[PDB]
Amino acid sequence: STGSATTTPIDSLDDAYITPVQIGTPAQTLNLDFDTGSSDLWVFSSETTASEVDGQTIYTPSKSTTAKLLSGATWSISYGDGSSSSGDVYTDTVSVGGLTVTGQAVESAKKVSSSFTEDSTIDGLLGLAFSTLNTVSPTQQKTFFDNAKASLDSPVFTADLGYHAPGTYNFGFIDTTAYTGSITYTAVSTKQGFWEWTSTGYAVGSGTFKSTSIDGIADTGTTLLYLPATVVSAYWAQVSGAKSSSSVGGYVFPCSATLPSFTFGVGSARIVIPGDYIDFGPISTGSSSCFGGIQSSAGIGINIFGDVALKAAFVVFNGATTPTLGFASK
Ligand SMILES: O=C(NC1CCCCC1)N[C@H]1[C@H](O)[C@@H](N2CCCCC2)[C@@H]2OC[C@H]1O2
Structure with missing residues:
Protein backbone atom coordinates (compact mmCIF):
# COMPACT_ATOMS: atom_id res chain seq x y z
CA SER A 1 0.00 0.00 0.00
CA THR A 2 0.87 3.64 -0.34
CA GLY A 3 -0.58 7.03 0.54
CA SER A 4 -0.07 10.55 -0.77
CA ALA A 5 -1.48 13.73 0.78
CA THR A 6 -0.97 17.40 0.03
CA THR A 7 0.29 19.56 2.88
CA THR A 8 -0.58 23.27 2.94
CA PRO A 9 1.01 26.19 4.76
CA ILE A 10 -1.22 27.65 7.46
CA ASP A 11 -0.24 31.23 6.64
CA SER A 12 1.82 33.44 4.33
CA LEU A 13 5.02 32.75 6.30
CA ASP A 14 4.92 28.93 6.25
CA ASP A 15 4.73 28.90 10.07
CA ALA A 16 3.50 25.35 9.80
CA TYR A 17 1.81 22.98 7.37
CA ILE A 18 -1.51 21.17 7.70
CA THR A 19 -2.48 17.89 6.06
CA PRO A 20 -6.03 16.51 5.94
CA VAL A 21 -6.51 13.26 7.87
CA GLN A 22 -9.58 11.05 7.93
CA ILE A 23 -10.51 9.69 11.35
CA GLY A 24 -13.38 7.37 12.15
CA THR A 25 -16.46 6.00 10.39
CA PRO A 26 -18.02 7.88 8.74
CA ALA A 27 -14.80 9.85 8.15
CA GLN A 28 -14.18 13.00 10.17
CA THR A 29 -11.53 15.07 8.38
CA LEU A 30 -9.17 17.06 10.56
CA ASN A 31 -6.23 19.15 9.44
CA LEU A 32 -3.21 17.94 11.37
CA ASP A 33 0.35 19.17 11.71
CA PHE A 34 2.61 16.30 10.63
CA ASP A 35 5.55 16.37 13.04
CA THR A 36 8.66 14.22 12.57
CA GLY A 37 9.85 15.60 15.93
CA SER A 38 7.14 14.01 18.10
CA SER A 39 5.23 10.75 18.28
CA ASP A 40 1.68 11.46 19.45
CA LEU A 41 -1.33 11.69 17.15
CA TRP A 42 -3.60 14.00 19.09
CA VAL A 43 -6.69 15.97 18.13
CA PHE A 44 -9.06 18.64 19.32
CA SER A 45 -12.23 16.78 20.27
CA SER A 46 -15.70 16.80 21.75
CA GLU A 47 -13.87 16.29 25.05
CA THR A 48 -11.75 19.43 24.78
CA THR A 49 -12.58 22.08 27.38
CA ALA A 50 -15.04 24.31 25.53
CA SER A 51 -13.28 27.58 26.37
CA GLU A 52 -10.09 26.11 24.85
CA VAL A 53 -11.65 25.50 21.43
CA ASP A 54 -11.78 28.47 19.03
CA GLY A 55 -12.43 27.61 15.41
CA GLN A 56 -10.75 24.20 15.24
CA THR A 57 -12.46 21.17 13.78
CA ILE A 58 -13.02 18.55 16.47
CA TYR A 59 -13.08 14.78 16.48
CA THR A 60 -16.19 13.32 18.12
CA PRO A 61 -15.56 9.66 18.95
CA SER A 62 -19.21 9.04 19.87
CA LYS A 63 -20.09 9.69 16.18
CA SER A 64 -17.62 7.08 14.94
CA THR A 65 -18.80 3.48 14.77
CA THR A 66 -15.18 2.23 14.76
CA ALA A 67 -14.04 4.27 17.78
CA LYS A 68 -13.23 2.33 20.95
CA LEU A 69 -12.05 3.85 24.23
CA LEU A 70 -8.53 2.67 25.01
CA SER A 71 -9.50 2.01 28.59
CA GLY A 72 -7.33 3.63 31.25
CA ALA A 73 -4.97 5.27 28.78
CA THR A 74 -3.97 8.90 29.16
CA TRP A 75 -1.45 11.15 27.46
CA SER A 76 0.30 14.41 28.20
CA ILE A 77 2.81 16.22 26.06
CA SER A 78 4.82 19.40 26.17
CA TYR A 79 6.62 20.84 23.17
CA GLY A 80 9.82 22.87 22.93
CA ASP A 81 7.93 26.09 22.36
CA GLY A 82 6.32 25.64 25.78
CA SER A 83 2.94 24.53 24.47
CA SER A 84 1.13 21.44 25.78
CA SER A 85 -1.94 19.27 25.64
CA SER A 86 -3.32 16.18 27.37
CA GLY A 87 -6.28 13.87 27.53
CA ASP A 88 -7.49 10.31 26.99
CA VAL A 89 -7.24 7.86 24.11
CA TYR A 90 -9.41 6.06 21.56
CA THR A 91 -8.45 3.65 18.87
CA ASP A 92 -10.06 4.27 15.49
CA THR A 93 -9.47 4.00 11.76
CA VAL A 94 -7.15 6.70 10.42
CA SER A 95 -6.46 7.39 6.76
CA VAL A 96 -3.90 9.68 5.16
CA GLY A 97 -3.95 10.23 1.42
CA GLY A 98 -5.60 6.86 0.77
CA LEU A 99 -3.48 4.88 3.25
CA THR A 100 -5.55 3.38 6.07
CA VAL A 101 -4.53 2.17 9.52
CA THR A 102 -7.09 0.40 11.68
CA GLY A 103 -6.71 0.51 15.46
CA GLN A 104 -4.64 3.69 15.44
CA ALA A 105 -4.29 5.40 18.83
CA VAL A 106 -6.10 8.75 18.48
CA GLU A 107 -5.29 10.88 21.49
CA SER A 108 -8.27 13.05 22.37
CA ALA A 109 -7.46 16.37 23.99
CA LYS A 110 -9.22 17.29 27.19
CA LYS A 111 -6.90 20.29 27.63
CA VAL A 112 -4.72 22.33 25.28
CA SER A 113 -2.49 25.31 26.03
CA SER A 114 -3.32 28.78 24.84
CA SER A 115 -1.09 28.69 21.74
CA PHE A 116 -3.13 25.79 20.38
CA THR A 117 -6.45 27.46 21.19
CA GLU A 118 -5.27 30.65 19.52
CA ASP A 119 -4.44 28.87 16.27
CA SER A 120 -7.69 28.01 14.54
CA THR A 121 -5.95 26.35 11.60
CA ILE A 122 -4.38 23.35 13.37
CA ASP A 123 -6.77 20.66 14.59
CA GLY A 124 -4.03 18.51 16.10
CA LEU A 125 -0.70 16.84 15.50
CA LEU A 126 0.35 13.62 13.80
CA GLY A 127 3.67 12.48 15.18
CA LEU A 128 6.20 10.80 12.89
CA ALA A 129 9.25 10.44 15.15
CA PHE A 130 9.97 7.07 16.75
CA SER A 131 7.23 5.47 18.86
CA THR A 132 9.57 5.38 21.87
CA LEU A 133 8.68 9.07 22.37
CA ASN A 134 4.93 8.40 22.47
CA THR A 135 3.45 9.73 25.71
CA VAL A 136 0.52 7.35 26.19
CA SER A 137 0.46 5.71 29.62
CA PRO A 138 0.46 3.00 30.88
CA THR A 139 0.75 1.40 27.44
CA GLN A 140 2.86 3.34 24.96
CA GLN A 141 1.28 3.55 21.50
CA LYS A 142 2.67 3.42 17.98
CA THR A 143 2.75 6.20 15.46
CA PHE A 144 0.69 6.15 12.31
CA PHE A 145 3.84 5.34 10.32
CA ASP A 146 4.87 2.57 12.69
CA ASN A 147 1.43 0.96 12.37
CA ALA A 148 1.39 1.34 8.57
CA LYS A 149 4.98 0.21 7.97
CA ALA A 150 4.52 -3.48 7.40
CA SER A 151 1.73 -2.88 4.88
CA LEU A 152 3.63 -0.27 2.87
CA ASP A 153 5.28 -1.10 -0.43
CA SER A 154 8.51 0.22 1.10
CA PRO A 155 8.94 1.21 4.79
CA VAL A 156 9.45 4.90 4.10
CA PHE A 157 7.74 8.25 4.04
CA THR A 158 8.84 11.42 2.28
CA ALA A 159 8.40 15.11 3.09
CA ASP A 160 8.35 17.59 0.23
CA LEU A 161 7.44 20.92 1.80
CA GLY A 162 6.78 23.93 -0.39
CA TYR A 163 8.10 27.45 -0.05
CA HIS A 164 5.04 29.68 0.26
CA ALA A 165 3.19 26.86 -1.49
CA PRO A 166 1.71 23.44 -0.84
CA GLY A 167 3.79 20.30 -0.82
CA THR A 168 3.35 16.59 -0.32
CA TYR A 169 3.75 13.78 2.20
CA ASN A 170 4.05 10.32 0.59
CA PHE A 171 3.97 7.01 2.42
CA GLY A 172 5.43 3.81 1.08
CA PHE A 173 7.15 5.02 -2.10
CA ILE A 174 9.70 7.50 -3.39
O1 LIG B 1 7.55 23.60 19.77
C1 LIG B 1 7.98 23.21 18.68
N1 LIG B 1 9.30 23.14 18.42
C2 LIG B 1 10.27 23.83 19.26
C3 LIG B 1 10.37 25.30 18.83
C4 LIG B 1 11.41 26.05 19.66
C5 LIG B 1 12.76 25.38 19.56
C6 LIG B 1 12.67 23.93 20.00
C7 LIG B 1 11.63 23.17 19.18
N2 LIG B 1 7.19 22.63 17.77
C8 LIG B 1 5.76 22.81 17.88
C9 LIG B 1 5.34 24.04 17.07
O2 LIG B 1 5.95 25.23 17.57
C10 LIG B 1 3.82 24.29 17.10
N3 LIG B 1 3.43 25.53 16.25
C11 LIG B 1 1.98 25.51 15.85
C12 LIG B 1 1.54 26.89 15.43
C13 LIG B 1 2.59 27.58 14.58
C14 LIG B 1 3.55 26.58 13.98
C15 LIG B 1 4.29 25.80 15.05
C16 LIG B 1 3.22 22.95 16.59
O3 LIG B 1 2.60 22.25 17.64
C17 LIG B 1 3.64 21.48 18.27
C18 LIG B 1 4.87 21.68 17.38
O4 LIG B 1 4.25 22.10 16.14
Whole structure:
Protein backbone atom coordinates (compact mmCIF):
# COMPACT_ATOMS: atom_id res chain seq x y z
CA SER A 1 0.00 0.00 0.00
CA THR A 2 0.87 3.64 -0.34
CA GLY A 3 -0.58 7.03 0.54
CA SER A 4 -0.07 10.55 -0.77
CA ALA A 5 -1.48 13.73 0.78
CA THR A 6 -0.97 17.40 0.03
CA THR A 7 0.29 19.56 2.88
CA THR A 8 -0.58 23.27 2.94
CA PRO A 9 1.01 26.19 4.76
CA ILE A 10 -1.22 27.65 7.46
CA ASP A 11 -0.24 31.23 6.64
CA SER A 12 1.82 33.44 4.33
CA LEU A 13 5.02 32.75 6.30
CA ASP A 14 4.92 28.93 6.25
CA ASP A 15 4.73 28.90 10.07
CA ALA A 16 3.50 25.35 9.80
CA TYR A 17 1.81 22.98 7.37
CA ILE A 18 -1.51 21.17 7.70
CA THR A 19 -2.48 17.89 6.06
CA PRO A 20 -6.03 16.51 5.94
CA VAL A 21 -6.51 13.26 7.87
CA GLN A 22 -9.58 11.05 7.93
CA ILE A 23 -10.51 9.69 11.35
CA GLY A 24 -13.38 7.37 12.15
CA THR A 25 -16.46 6.00 10.39
CA PRO A 26 -18.02 7.88 8.74
CA ALA A 27 -14.80 9.85 8.15
CA GLN A 28 -14.18 13.00 10.17
CA THR A 29 -11.53 15.07 8.38
CA LEU A 30 -9.17 17.06 10.56
CA ASN A 31 -6.23 19.15 9.44
CA LEU A 32 -3.21 17.94 11.37
CA ASP A 33 0.35 19.17 11.71
CA PHE A 34 2.61 16.30 10.63
CA ASP A 35 5.55 16.37 13.04
CA THR A 36 8.66 14.22 12.57
CA GLY A 37 9.85 15.60 15.93
CA SER A 38 7.14 14.01 18.10
CA SER A 39 5.23 10.75 18.28
CA ASP A 40 1.68 11.46 19.45
CA LEU A 41 -1.33 11.69 17.15
CA TRP A 42 -3.60 14.00 19.09
CA VAL A 43 -6.69 15.97 18.13
CA PHE A 44 -9.06 18.64 19.32
CA SER A 45 -12.23 16.78 20.27
CA SER A 46 -15.70 16.80 21.75
CA GLU A 47 -13.87 16.29 25.05
CA THR A 48 -11.75 19.43 24.78
CA THR A 49 -12.58 22.08 27.38
CA ALA A 50 -15.04 24.31 25.53
CA SER A 51 -13.28 27.58 26.37
CA GLU A 52 -10.09 26.11 24.85
CA VAL A 53 -11.65 25.50 21.43
CA ASP A 54 -11.78 28.47 19.03
CA GLY A 55 -12.43 27.61 15.41
CA GLN A 56 -10.75 24.20 15.24
CA THR A 57 -12.46 21.17 13.78
CA ILE A 58 -13.02 18.55 16.47
CA TYR A 59 -13.08 14.78 16.48
CA THR A 60 -16.19 13.32 18.12
CA PRO A 61 -15.56 9.66 18.95
CA SER A 62 -19.21 9.04 19.87
CA LYS A 63 -20.09 9.69 16.18
CA SER A 64 -17.62 7.08 14.94
CA THR A 65 -18.80 3.48 14.77
CA THR A 66 -15.18 2.23 14.76
CA ALA A 67 -14.04 4.27 17.78
CA LYS A 68 -13.23 2.33 20.95
CA LEU A 69 -12.05 3.85 24.23
CA LEU A 70 -8.53 2.67 25.01
CA SER A 71 -9.50 2.01 28.59
CA GLY A 72 -7.33 3.63 31.25
CA ALA A 73 -4.97 5.27 28.78
CA THR A 74 -3.97 8.90 29.16
CA TRP A 75 -1.45 11.15 27.46
CA SER A 76 0.30 14.41 28.20
CA ILE A 77 2.81 16.22 26.06
CA SER A 78 4.82 19.40 26.17
CA TYR A 79 6.62 20.84 23.17
CA GLY A 80 9.82 22.87 22.93
CA ASP A 81 7.93 26.09 22.36
CA GLY A 82 6.32 25.64 25.78
CA SER A 83 2.94 24.53 24.47
CA SER A 84 1.13 21.44 25.78
CA SER A 85 -1.94 19.27 25.64
CA SER A 86 -3.32 16.18 27.37
CA GLY A 87 -6.28 13.87 27.53
CA ASP A 88 -7.49 10.31 26.99
CA VAL A 89 -7.24 7.86 24.11
CA TYR A 90 -9.41 6.06 21.56
CA THR A 91 -8.45 3.65 18.87
CA ASP A 92 -10.06 4.27 15.49
CA THR A 93 -9.47 4.00 11.76
CA VAL A 94 -7.15 6.70 10.42
CA SER A 95 -6.46 7.39 6.76
CA VAL A 96 -3.90 9.68 5.16
CA GLY A 97 -3.95 10.23 1.42
CA GLY A 98 -5.60 6.86 0.77
CA LEU A 99 -3.48 4.88 3.25
CA THR A 100 -5.55 3.38 6.07
CA VAL A 101 -4.53 2.17 9.52
CA THR A 102 -7.09 0.40 11.68
CA GLY A 103 -6.71 0.51 15.46
CA GLN A 104 -4.64 3.69 15.44
CA ALA A 105 -4.29 5.40 18.83
CA VAL A 106 -6.10 8.75 18.48
CA GLU A 107 -5.29 10.88 21.49
CA SER A 108 -8.27 13.05 22.37
CA ALA A 109 -7.46 16.37 23.99
CA LYS A 110 -9.22 17.29 27.19
CA LYS A 111 -6.90 20.29 27.63
CA VAL A 112 -4.72 22.33 25.28
CA SER A 113 -2.49 25.31 26.03
CA SER A 114 -3.32 28.78 24.84
CA SER A 115 -1.09 28.69 21.74
CA PHE A 116 -3.13 25.79 20.38
CA THR A 117 -6.45 27.46 21.19
CA GLU A 118 -5.27 30.65 19.52
CA ASP A 119 -4.44 28.87 16.27
CA SER A 120 -7.69 28.01 14.54
CA THR A 121 -5.95 26.35 11.60
CA ILE A 122 -4.38 23.35 13.37
CA ASP A 123 -6.77 20.66 14.59
CA GLY A 124 -4.03 18.51 16.10
CA LEU A 125 -0.70 16.84 15.50
CA LEU A 126 0.35 13.62 13.80
CA GLY A 127 3.67 12.48 15.18
CA LEU A 128 6.20 10.80 12.89
CA ALA A 129 9.25 10.44 15.15
CA PHE A 130 9.97 7.07 16.75
CA SER A 131 7.23 5.47 18.86
CA THR A 132 9.57 5.38 21.87
CA LEU A 133 8.68 9.07 22.37
CA ASN A 134 4.93 8.40 22.47
CA THR A 135 3.45 9.73 25.71
CA VAL A 136 0.52 7.35 26.19
CA SER A 137 0.46 5.71 29.62
CA PRO A 138 0.46 3.00 30.88
CA THR A 139 0.75 1.40 27.44
CA GLN A 140 2.86 3.34 24.96
CA GLN A 141 1.28 3.55 21.50
CA LYS A 142 2.67 3.42 17.98
CA THR A 143 2.75 6.20 15.46
CA PHE A 144 0.69 6.15 12.31
CA PHE A 145 3.84 5.34 10.32
CA ASP A 146 4.87 2.57 12.69
CA ASN A 147 1.43 0.96 12.37
CA ALA A 148 1.39 1.34 8.57
CA LYS A 149 4.98 0.21 7.97
CA ALA A 150 4.52 -3.48 7.40
CA SER A 151 1.73 -2.88 4.88
CA LEU A 152 3.63 -0.27 2.87
CA ASP A 153 5.28 -1.10 -0.43
CA SER A 154 8.51 0.22 1.10
CA PRO A 155 8.94 1.21 4.79
CA VAL A 156 9.45 4.90 4.10
CA PHE A 157 7.74 8.25 4.04
CA THR A 158 8.84 11.42 2.28
CA ALA A 159 8.40 15.11 3.09
CA ASP A 160 8.35 17.59 0.23
CA LEU A 161 7.44 20.92 1.80
CA GLY A 162 6.78 23.93 -0.39
CA TYR A 163 8.10 27.45 -0.05
CA HIS A 164 5.04 29.68 0.26
CA ALA A 165 3.19 26.86 -1.49
CA PRO A 166 1.71 23.44 -0.84
CA GLY A 167 3.79 20.30 -0.82
CA THR A 168 3.35 16.59 -0.32
CA TYR A 169 3.75 13.78 2.20
CA ASN A 170 4.05 10.32 0.59
CA PHE A 171 3.97 7.01 2.42
CA GLY A 172 5.43 3.81 1.08
CA PHE A 173 7.15 5.02 -2.10
CA ILE A 174 9.70 7.50 -3.39
CA ASP A 175 8.39 9.79 -6.16
CA THR A 176 11.40 9.95 -8.46
CA THR A 177 9.80 12.91 -10.33
CA ALA A 178 9.76 15.06 -7.18
CA TYR A 179 13.49 15.85 -6.98
CA THR A 180 16.55 16.63 -9.09
CA GLY A 181 19.84 14.76 -9.09
CA SER A 182 20.25 11.92 -6.61
CA ILE A 183 19.17 11.30 -3.04
CA THR A 184 22.02 11.29 -0.55
CA TYR A 185 21.36 9.01 2.41
CA THR A 186 22.90 9.56 5.83
CA ALA A 187 22.93 7.63 9.10
CA VAL A 188 20.31 8.10 11.78
CA SER A 189 20.55 7.61 15.52
CA THR A 190 17.26 6.68 17.15
CA LYS A 191 18.73 6.86 20.66
CA GLN A 192 16.82 10.04 21.54
CA GLY A 193 13.72 8.93 19.60
CA PHE A 194 14.27 11.48 16.80
CA TRP A 195 15.37 11.33 13.17
CA GLU A 196 18.77 12.45 14.42
CA TRP A 197 21.60 12.80 11.94
CA THR A 198 24.89 14.66 11.42
CA SER A 199 25.28 17.36 8.80
CA THR A 200 28.79 17.59 7.32
CA GLY A 201 29.00 21.39 7.44
CA TYR A 202 27.73 24.64 6.04
CA ALA A 203 28.30 27.69 3.88
CA VAL A 204 26.94 31.21 4.00
CA GLY A 205 25.99 32.70 0.63
CA SER A 206 28.74 32.26 -1.94
CA GLY A 207 31.25 31.63 0.84
CA THR A 208 33.54 28.63 1.23
CA PHE A 209 32.10 25.47 2.72
CA LYS A 210 33.08 24.81 6.34
CA SER A 211 33.45 21.11 7.09
CA THR A 212 32.16 20.51 10.58
CA SER A 213 29.87 17.91 12.11
CA ILE A 214 26.50 19.27 13.18
CA ASP A 215 24.27 16.78 14.95
CA GLY A 216 20.58 17.57 14.80
CA ILE A 217 17.05 16.38 14.13
CA ALA A 218 14.92 16.49 11.01
CA ASP A 219 11.80 18.10 12.44
CA THR A 220 8.82 19.00 10.23
CA GLY A 221 6.95 20.32 13.27
CA THR A 222 9.49 23.08 13.89
CA THR A 223 9.30 26.18 11.74
CA LEU A 224 12.85 27.44 11.85
CA LEU A 225 16.42 26.21 11.50
CA TYR A 226 18.21 26.07 14.88
CA LEU A 227 21.98 25.71 14.76
CA PRO A 228 25.03 26.34 17.01
CA ALA A 229 25.57 29.99 18.00
CA THR A 230 28.89 30.06 16.04
CA VAL A 231 27.18 29.04 12.80
CA VAL A 232 24.23 31.40 13.28
CA SER A 233 26.55 34.33 14.06
CA ALA A 234 28.56 33.64 10.91
CA TYR A 235 25.34 33.73 8.89
CA TRP A 236 23.86 36.95 10.31
CA ALA A 237 27.23 38.75 10.18
CA GLN A 238 26.66 38.78 6.40
CA VAL A 239 23.42 40.81 6.78
CA SER A 240 23.96 44.53 7.44
CA GLY A 241 22.19 45.62 10.61
CA ALA A 242 21.22 42.14 11.77
CA LYS A 243 21.45 41.56 15.49
CA SER A 244 20.33 39.21 18.19
CA SER A 245 17.55 40.76 20.24
CA SER A 246 16.83 39.29 23.65
CA SER A 247 13.63 41.36 23.78
CA VAL A 248 12.36 39.79 20.56
CA GLY A 249 13.92 36.38 21.27
CA GLY A 250 16.40 35.90 18.48
CA TYR A 251 18.09 37.37 15.45
CA VAL A 252 16.22 40.13 13.66
CA PHE A 253 17.31 41.98 10.52
CA PRO A 254 16.25 45.07 8.54
CA CYS A 255 13.30 44.28 6.32
CA SER A 256 15.19 46.19 3.57
CA ALA A 257 17.94 43.52 3.52
CA THR A 258 18.62 40.96 0.82
CA LEU A 259 19.38 37.71 2.65
CA PRO A 260 22.17 35.37 1.56
CA SER A 261 21.56 31.67 1.02
CA PHE A 262 22.61 29.06 3.55
CA THR A 263 24.03 25.71 2.46
CA PHE A 264 24.13 22.58 4.63
CA GLY A 265 26.04 19.37 4.04
CA VAL A 266 24.55 15.90 3.69
CA GLY A 267 27.59 13.69 3.28
CA SER A 268 29.42 15.00 0.20
CA ALA A 269 26.20 16.58 -1.10
CA ARG A 270 24.86 20.08 -0.50
CA ILE A 271 21.37 21.50 0.07
CA VAL A 272 21.02 25.21 -0.60
CA ILE A 273 18.42 27.20 1.30
CA PRO A 274 17.63 30.37 -0.69
CA GLY A 275 17.85 33.63 1.19
CA ASP A 276 14.14 34.32 0.87
CA TYR A 277 13.36 31.13 2.82
CA ILE A 278 15.05 32.70 5.84
CA ASP A 279 12.76 35.77 5.93
CA PHE A 280 9.95 35.44 8.50
CA GLY A 281 8.68 38.94 8.06
CA PRO A 282 8.07 41.90 10.35
CA ILE A 283 8.29 41.11 14.05
CA SER A 284 5.02 42.99 14.47
CA THR A 285 2.68 44.42 11.86
CA GLY A 286 4.25 47.43 10.16
CA SER A 287 7.66 46.96 11.74
CA SER A 288 10.80 47.37 9.65
CA SER A 289 12.53 44.74 11.78
CA CYS A 290 12.11 41.21 10.42
CA PHE A 291 12.53 37.88 12.16
CA GLY A 292 15.26 35.55 11.03
CA GLY A 293 14.67 31.97 9.88
CA ILE A 294 18.01 30.79 11.26
CA GLN A 295 18.31 30.98 15.03
CA SER A 296 20.60 29.70 17.77
CA SER A 297 19.98 26.29 19.31
CA ALA A 298 22.11 27.22 22.32
CA GLY A 299 19.20 27.18 24.77
CA ILE A 300 17.56 24.01 23.38
CA GLY A 301 20.12 21.24 23.82
CA ILE A 302 19.90 19.95 20.26
CA ASN A 303 20.14 21.38 16.76
CA ILE A 304 16.91 21.34 14.75
CA PHE A 305 16.63 21.13 10.99
CA GLY A 306 13.11 22.50 10.90
CA ASP A 307 10.97 23.59 7.98
CA VAL A 308 13.35 26.32 6.78
CA ALA A 309 15.91 23.62 5.97
CA LEU A 310 13.58 20.78 5.05
CA LYS A 311 11.51 22.75 2.54
CA ALA A 312 14.67 23.27 0.48
CA ALA A 313 14.92 19.51 -0.08
CA PHE A 314 13.06 16.34 -0.91
CA VAL A 315 13.50 14.35 2.33
CA VAL A 316 13.25 10.58 2.73
CA PHE A 317 12.47 9.17 6.16
CA ASN A 318 13.62 5.59 5.74
CA GLY A 319 12.15 3.37 8.43
CA ALA A 320 13.95 0.16 7.48
CA THR A 321 15.41 -1.99 10.27
CA THR A 322 18.32 0.41 10.44
CA PRO A 323 16.68 3.78 9.73
CA THR A 324 18.32 6.43 7.56
CA LEU A 325 17.54 9.88 6.15
CA GLY A 326 17.80 10.91 2.52
CA PHE A 327 18.07 14.42 1.05
CA ALA A 328 17.83 15.54 -2.56
CA SER A 329 17.68 18.96 -4.13
CA LYS A 330 14.48 19.84 -5.97
O1 LIG B 1 7.55 23.60 19.77
C1 LIG B 1 7.98 23.21 18.68
N1 LIG B 1 9.30 23.14 18.42
C2 LIG B 1 10.27 23.83 19.26
C3 LIG B 1 10.37 25.30 18.83
C4 LIG B 1 11.41 26.05 19.66
C5 LIG B 1 12.76 25.38 19.56
C6 LIG B 1 12.67 23.93 20.00
C7 LIG B 1 11.63 23.17 19.18
N2 LIG B 1 7.19 22.63 17.77
C8 LIG B 1 5.76 22.81 17.88
C9 LIG B 1 5.34 24.04 17.07
O2 LIG B 1 5.95 25.23 17.57
C10 LIG B 1 3.82 24.29 17.10
N3 LIG B 1 3.43 25.53 16.25
C11 LIG B 1 1.98 25.51 15.85
C12 LIG B 1 1.54 26.89 15.43
C13 LIG B 1 2.59 27.58 14.58
C14 LIG B 1 3.55 26.58 13.98
C15 LIG B 1 4.29 25.80 15.05
C16 LIG B 1 3.22 22.95 16.59
O3 LIG B 1 2.60 22.25 17.64
C17 LIG B 1 3.64 21.48 18.27
C18 LIG B 1 4.87 21.68 17.38
O4 LIG B 1 4.25 22.10 16.14
